[PDB]
Amino acid sequence: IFIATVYFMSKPRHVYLVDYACYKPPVTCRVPFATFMEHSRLILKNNPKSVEFQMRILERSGLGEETCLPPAIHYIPPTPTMEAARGEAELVIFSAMDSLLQKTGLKPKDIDILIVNCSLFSPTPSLSAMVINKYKLRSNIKSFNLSGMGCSAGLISIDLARDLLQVHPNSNAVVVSTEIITPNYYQGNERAMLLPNCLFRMGGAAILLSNRRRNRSRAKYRLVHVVRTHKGADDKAYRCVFEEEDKEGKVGISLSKDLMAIAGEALKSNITTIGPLVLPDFKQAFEHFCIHAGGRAVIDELQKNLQLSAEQVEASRMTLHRFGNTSSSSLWYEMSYIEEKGRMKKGDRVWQIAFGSGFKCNSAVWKCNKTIKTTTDNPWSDCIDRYPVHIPEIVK
Amino acid sequence: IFIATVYFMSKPRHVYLVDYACYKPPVTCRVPFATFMEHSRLILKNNPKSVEFQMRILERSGLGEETCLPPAIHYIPPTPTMEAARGEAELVIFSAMDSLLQKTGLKPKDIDILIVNCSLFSPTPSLSAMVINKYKLRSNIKSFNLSGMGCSAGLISIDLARDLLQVHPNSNAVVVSTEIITPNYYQGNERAMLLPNCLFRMGGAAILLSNRRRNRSRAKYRLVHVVRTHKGADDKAYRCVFEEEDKEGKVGISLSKDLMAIAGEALKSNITTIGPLVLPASEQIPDFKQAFEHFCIHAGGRAVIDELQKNLQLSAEQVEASRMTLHRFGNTSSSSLWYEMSYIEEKGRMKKGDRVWQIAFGSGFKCNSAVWKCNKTIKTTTDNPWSDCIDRYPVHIPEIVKL
Amino acid sequence: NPENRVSGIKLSSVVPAKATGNQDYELKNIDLAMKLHYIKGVYFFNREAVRGLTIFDLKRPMFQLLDIFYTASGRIRRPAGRPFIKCNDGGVRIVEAFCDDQTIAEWLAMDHESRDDCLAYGSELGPDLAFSPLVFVQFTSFKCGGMSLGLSWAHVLGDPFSASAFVSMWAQIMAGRVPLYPIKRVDPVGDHWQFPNNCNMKTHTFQFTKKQLDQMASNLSHFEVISATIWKLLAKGVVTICRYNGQRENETASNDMVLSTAELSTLIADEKVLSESSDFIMYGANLTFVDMEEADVYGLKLQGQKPVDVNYSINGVGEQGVVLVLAGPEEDRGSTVTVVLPENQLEKLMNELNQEWNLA
Amino acid sequence: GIKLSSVVPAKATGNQDYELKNIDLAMKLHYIKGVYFFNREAVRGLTIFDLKRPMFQLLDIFYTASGRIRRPETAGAGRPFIKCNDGGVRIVEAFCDDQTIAEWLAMDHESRDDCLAYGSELGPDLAFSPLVFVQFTSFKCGGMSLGLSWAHVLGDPFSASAFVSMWAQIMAGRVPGNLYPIKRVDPVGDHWQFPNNCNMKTHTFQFTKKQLDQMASNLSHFEVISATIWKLLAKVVTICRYNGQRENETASNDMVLSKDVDEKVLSESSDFIMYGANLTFVDMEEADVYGLKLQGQKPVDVNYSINGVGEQGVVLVLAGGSTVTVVLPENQLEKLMNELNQEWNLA
Numbered sequence A: 001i002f003i004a005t006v007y008f009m010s011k012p013r014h015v016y017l018v019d020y021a022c023y024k025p026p027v028t029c030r031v032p033f034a035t036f037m038e039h040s041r042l043i044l045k046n047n048p049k050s051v052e053f054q055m056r057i058l059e060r061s062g063l064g065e066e067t068c069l070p071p072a073i074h075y076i077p078p079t080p081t082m083e084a085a086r087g088e089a090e091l092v093i094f095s096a097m098d099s100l101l102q103k104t105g106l107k108p109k110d111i112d113i114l115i116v117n118c119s120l121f122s123p124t125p126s127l128s129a130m131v132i133n134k135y136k137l138r139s140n141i142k143s144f145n146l147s148g149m150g151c152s153a154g155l156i157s158i159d160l161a162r163d164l165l166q167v168h169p170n171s172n173a174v175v176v177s178t179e180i181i182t183p184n185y186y187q188g189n190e191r192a193m194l195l196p197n198c199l200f201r202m203g204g205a206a207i208l209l210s211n212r213r214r215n216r217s218r219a220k221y222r223l224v225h226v227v228r229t230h231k232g233a234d235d236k237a238y239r240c241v242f243e244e245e246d247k248e249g250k251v252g253i254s255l256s257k258d259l260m261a262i263a264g265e266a267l268k269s270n271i272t273t274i275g276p277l278v279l280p281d282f283k284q285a286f287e288h289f290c291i292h293a294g295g296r297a298v299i300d301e302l303q304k305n306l307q308l309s310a311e312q313v314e315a316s317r318m319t320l321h322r323f324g325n326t327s328s329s330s331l332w333y334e335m336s337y338i339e340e341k342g343r344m345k346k347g348d349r350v351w352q353i354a355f356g357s358g359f360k361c362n363s364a365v366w367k368c369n370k371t372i373k374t375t376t377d378n379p380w381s382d383c384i385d386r387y388p389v390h391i392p393e394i395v396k
Numbered sequence B: 001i002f003i004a005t006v007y008f009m010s011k012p013r014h015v016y017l018v019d020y021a022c023y024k025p026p027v028t029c030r031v032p033f034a035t036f037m038e039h040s041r042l043i044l045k046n047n048p049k050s051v052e053f054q055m056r057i058l059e060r061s062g063l064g065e066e067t068c069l070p071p072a073i074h075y076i077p078p079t080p081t082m083e084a085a086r087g088e089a090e091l092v093i094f095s096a097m098d099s100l101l102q103k104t105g106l107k108p109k110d111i112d113i114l115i116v117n118c119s120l121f122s123p124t125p126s127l128s129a130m131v132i133n134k135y136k137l138r139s140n141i142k143s144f145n146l147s148g149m150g151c152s153a154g155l156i157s158i159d160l161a162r163d164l165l166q167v168h169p170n171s172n173a174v175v176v177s178t179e180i181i182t183p184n185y186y187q188g189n190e191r192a193m194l195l196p197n198c199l200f201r202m203g204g205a206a207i208l209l210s211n212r213r214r215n216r217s218r219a220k221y222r223l224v225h226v227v228r229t230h231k232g233a234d235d236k237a238y239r240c241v242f243e244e245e246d247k248e249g250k251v252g253i254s255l256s257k258d259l260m261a262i263a264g265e266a267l268k269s270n271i272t273t274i275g276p277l278v279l280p281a282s283e284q285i286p287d288f289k290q291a292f293e294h295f296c297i298h299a300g301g302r303a304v305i306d307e308l309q310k311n312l313q314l315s316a317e318q319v320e321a322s323r324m325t326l327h328r329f330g331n332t333s334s335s336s337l338w339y340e341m342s343y344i345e346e347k348g349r350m351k352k353g354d355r356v357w358q359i360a361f362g363s364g365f366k367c368n369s370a371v372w373k374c375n376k377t378i379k380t381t382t383d384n385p386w387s388d389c390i391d392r393y394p395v396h397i398p399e400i401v402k403l
Numbered sequence C: 001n002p003e004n005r006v007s008g009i010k011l012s013s014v015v016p017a018k019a020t021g022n023q024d025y026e027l028k029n030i031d032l033a034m035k036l037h038y039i040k041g042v043y044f045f046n047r048e049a050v051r052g053l054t055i056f057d058l059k060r061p062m063f064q065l066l067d068i069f070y071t072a073s074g075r076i077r078r079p080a081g082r083p084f085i086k087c088n089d090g091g092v093r094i095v096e097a098f099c100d101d102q103t104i105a106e107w108l109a110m111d112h113e114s115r116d117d118c119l120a121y122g123s124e125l126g127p128d129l130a131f132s133p134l135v136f137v138q139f140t141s142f143k144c145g146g147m148s149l150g151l152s153w154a155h156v157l158g159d160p161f162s163a164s165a166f167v168s169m170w171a172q173i174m175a176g177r178v179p180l181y182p183i184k185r186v187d188p189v190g191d192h193w194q195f196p197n198n199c200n201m202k203t204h205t206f207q208f209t210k211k212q213l214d215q216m217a218s219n220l221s222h223f224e225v226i227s228a229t230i231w232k233l234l235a236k237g238v239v240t241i242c243r244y245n246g247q248r249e250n251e252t253a254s255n256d257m258v259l260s261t262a263e264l265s266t267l268i269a270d271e272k273v274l275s276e277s278s279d280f281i282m283y284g285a286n287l288t289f290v291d292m293e294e295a296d297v298y299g300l301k302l303q304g305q306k307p308v309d310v311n312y313s314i315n316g317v318g319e320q321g322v323v324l325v326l327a328g329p330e331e332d333r334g335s336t337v338t339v340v341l342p343e344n345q346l347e348k349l350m351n352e353l354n355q356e357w358n359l360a
Numbered sequence D: 001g002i003k004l005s006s007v008v009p010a011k012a013t014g015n016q017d018y019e020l021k022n023i024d025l026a027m028k029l030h031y032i033k034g035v036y037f038f039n040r041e042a043v044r045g046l047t048i049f050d051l052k053r054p055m056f057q058l059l060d061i062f063y064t065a066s067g068r069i070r071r072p073e074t075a076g077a078g079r080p081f082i083k084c085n086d087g088g089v090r091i092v093e094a095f096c097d098d099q100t101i102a103e104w105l106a107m108d109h110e111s112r113d114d115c116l117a118y119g120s121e122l123g124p125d126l127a128f129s130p131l132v133f134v135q136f137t138s139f140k141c142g143g144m145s146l147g148l149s150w151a152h153v154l155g156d157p158f159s160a161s162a163f164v165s166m167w168a169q170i171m172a173g174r175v176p177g178n179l180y181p182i183k184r185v186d187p188v189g190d191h192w193q194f195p196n197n198c199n200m201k202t203h204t205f206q207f208t209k210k211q212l213d214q215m216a217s218n219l220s221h222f223e224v225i226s227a228t229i230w231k232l233l234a235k236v237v238t239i240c241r242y243n244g245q246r247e248n249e250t251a252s253n254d255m256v257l258s259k260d261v262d263e264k265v266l267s268e269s270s271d272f273i274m275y276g277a278n279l280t281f282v283d284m285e286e287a288d289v290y291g292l293k294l295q296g297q298k299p300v301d302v303n304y305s306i307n308g309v310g311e312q313g314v315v316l317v318l319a320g321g322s323t324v325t326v327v328l329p330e331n332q333l334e335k336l337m338n339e340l341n342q343e344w345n346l347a
């Protein structure tokens, strides 16, 4: 026997998405359009042009009336402090982690890898450190905290987990994708940097991954692929989403005018690297698509490029509507949507696309390990009945 | 053939430290003791007690007159802006990367993994994206940016690189570890977040790791072990080094009074966990000084070096690299270890088969050890951070330095 | 300057838990006829009632409460046409205030000029009608402790009884319970909806004890006694008494006031004026004697406690004056009298009341 | 919106000690202030880092210009000395977004150059008092003003001239009872400054070559100016002059007084004043102030001032024409002024 000695020994391990918990923002936090515009008028009294720009950007963003913002951003002078950001981080991360631990029955002593990704908020000790302290994790845990890597960092985390799971047998990896938006709020009137204020909302997700063979039946999905693209080499595609300062000393995320075109290119490259891998022309390769909810414009561009139907690009639109731009964790809200409509059959291929600053564009392919039953503990438990709502072209 | 094939497919890959370049601050930014104290008096005029505290903890800090700070703290008062922080990041990281690429002759396209490490500076796009744009790395590069993980993150990054080299055969991993000081300066006057102002100085390091067989004879070291400890479950060990705002609204790093005990406990647990892996069968208080040839203790301060020398019973000649790096470059954070190595390669002590034990402590409370084995006898060079001053060292570090 | 007694306030908004739906809400002719007047109701609570109560604890019941009062978070919209309360969830405006300088007792003992205008924050509707909050709720925390709840209520939304019901429902939900023309016509105001202050009329609060009220009634219920005394000591042609309809509970804000024009104690004891779309005013138009004695302001239950003082006042008063009569703080029933007069009339009333009961 | 930074020598000095001769201690109370002006073409976008870079090497040959005053541990009132603790010179960055170089050149008296050259007295905190302030004022037009505030204890005005001369060279790339003029005064402790008992004011004015020739015919620029000023004031004047020889001299003092009173007329018991003690007539005459080049452009104008002037008053004369700065205590300030206003319309 020589074929077995060269096949099984050098066979990649299977990485399973055992479960995940999405954060459900409090039902007493919504930020309606009218309240947002009233506060915006109050903050930008001396810049009516900025107010008009914000109104135009927010009235065609596809967001709903149930999106949530941190308590610190509630005051008409929004004063984001370090304590407020830490409190929001604790809230979201611990809620998602508690939901995950109750769902999976996982013990804190069983967590071998812990990867936390959150772009803007990078405290010290890290976010993974506060998770470890909260759950008293093992003293020999592989704790990683990625920051500054944008909205695609979510999938990056998954990739990292996968790699680690190939090196360490019988291990569990917890991946916490979030974006604490209290420090991300832009305290200025520069038009280019006011988009994140209009679009970004609260969210988060705690994901459990495992190569353990005992999870070959409990697992929801089985990670097939994680493709990555980094257009940072191109100078134009590097400055696309650039954190910087305005002419008044305020830090914000300036978005380039050409951010559309470059984004397109990146996506194309990714679908040129994921095509041959899944090739037995993508609307028939996969059964479900999770396009990152980065604004209805990019979703429309991807739909017109890949020739997706209204129902295929529906979890992304409805996730943008219900939760807004929850950043790297949005990919998971979309997942929940597909699961809760009773559309997650066994063997179904799910393709997640997450594109963000860098300019990075990553994608992942999962396969449904088991048919997913509709559940009550989830971020869609109440609003799933109304959806798919009719998102209007312009709201007032 | 069966057993041989099983062993070959089950044997872990070898990770090699092909080379590494350290940032050498120019001789225009050095901050003598008197100038630092004068700027402190000018800035913190309102609160004399804070100035007296800074003088007390800087006169016995064990630093020297050649430590460097970025060109934003030079002013009175400092004006740390995002542009200044980005400029310092470019100045340090691009210099270190250029030195690495010139030392190793590494083509940018040959870089497969890129792990950047900086605690308190986390721009968007990340520093790894900055490197990728500068050197036009590939679009399928495994790029990671670890931040918030403190001083020990330097040994976290390389650890990750190892875990990524054993999954991807025939690949290069560049690990950059720095600490940008401009977004690190406390602008308040509380006597708890001023010590990091006194100790921390600018520096960096870039490291090329590789599991390729061609980079095997020329490799400088072979990564033997990496042992990680995280005293984070304890609340005291978690809050010992905490980033928070003061009474006026200024972010800084508060250090608890019971920090020496926590750091000692973390070091003790780490050395206990690493003892079985390296100690010879003869020892198995087993002597750690009989298992390693060279030691690189993180230059976090004189107190920790004294504690380790008293516990491990290290002779004054084995903590020489740590003390001299602290004196020369100051507390360069995670990259300090990579300066200390360059001290034991320039005096000339890196013989083939030697064992190097690097211990880095930091917030979390994290504490990580690495054990390297000198692959080849390393010869002195003139493109090192110690090039212009290694002849004058080791110096006599006085207990108290008069102002 | 009493207006500076509070140094720094934090403003925020609170919205209904469930999106109302942006449905329209037509306003009756009576409502549009009182779109210039506003209610200021301040409740005081001692240190016991605020035992370990944070901002979130106070703001939590507001979401359910506004789910009930779906119009309290709406905004005025116009098609030139008649305004209507669009139910888009702009929310009510929450104002957190701190008064480290003084305590509740000092406020109770301080002069009443410009006294509670800084405890119940809130502007008028305009000149930006589309973005004008209809309700301002201010929680003020003093030096020694205790909390003051100041409600600024747009009268177009509802009558003062509706404001009292709003506060009562807030308290109950926090506890845990599960749910000579009488009306003058004036010049157009456009989209600012604020009566101009042609004169320098002043406001003042009088406190009457049970014994004083029963003693001064001999020369003439509590309301009739106070009204007759004020009329006799003020005129030294008609009076428009307002009574409202207190038969309401767990209902949305409504405006169902009852007028009674009397052409002096006997006059006190014993409707188509609005044409279609003019700008009207009746408070301070013909010496209105508004009352809230048929309310239960002191029946609030905060942490098993009751308010130590309730002050109700009217903004937008006309040229004549407004007399507000409210139940006193239990014990020996008293009476709080928040009244606005032109400076001269207020001075005469103060002199007469100081001569009689040494009240000034 | 000025910005203050420090510059330290590139090479550590190791905490040397510089003994201050009795002359330096006696004359420690005075301060030189020299302001030079440079036109648009002399700059063409000079970064402050580029300007500061030469200072790092320059301070190596002027190391004493980075130390701090100190007293011996033997006693609390010992002989002051310059400890080379590498405190560094104080670099000031200023931007004039309202006035141009020409506007400042035409700008008249009443503290024209005080705003153009930052300075401070050596005290009351001697241990942390910079000895040298170098201020770069960038005007909206484009020209710069270099203001050098130089403690006289460090050196004489010609020493500051040599300092700025070598700065410019290395920037270009070149490799580096009542008759006694000195009066004892009440000790000032550790705060080296002289309070003014009267209305002590200064005025600066320039004489063109034509008027200088006319006055010489009426009567060298030194003699003409001395006679003119003395006659105008009349209707002891001890003169201070340079030694007469120098080549890349370091920070020192080689001034000479004329009646040449011997320098052995003082001790270390108390403090002393020389400038302005008896109508001093400091005259630099020749100097490389205008001979220096920055990017090949000669300085448009240079002005020197003395701070810590004595009660009687001082006169400083430099080769421009000729620039004269006269500092007086009393109403003679106006008197002489009006005389000029009647002859050369100077006012």
Ligand SMILES: CCCCCCCCCCCC
Residues within 6 Å of the ligand: A028, A029, A030, A031, A032, A035, A036, A039, A040, A043, A069, A073, A074, A197, C013, C014, C015, C091
């Ligand atoms: C519960 C109501 C919360 C309302 C939050 C409004 C946020 C305003 C953002 C202002 C954007 C300029």
Ligand SMILES: CCCCCCCCCCCC
Residues within 6 Å of the ligand: B028, B029, B030, B031, B032, B035, B036, B039, B040, B041, B043, B069, B073, B074, B075, D006, D007, D008
């Ligand atoms: C070459 C100039 C070096 C100046 C270094 C001074 C740094 C200031 C530190 C301020 C600490 C209070």
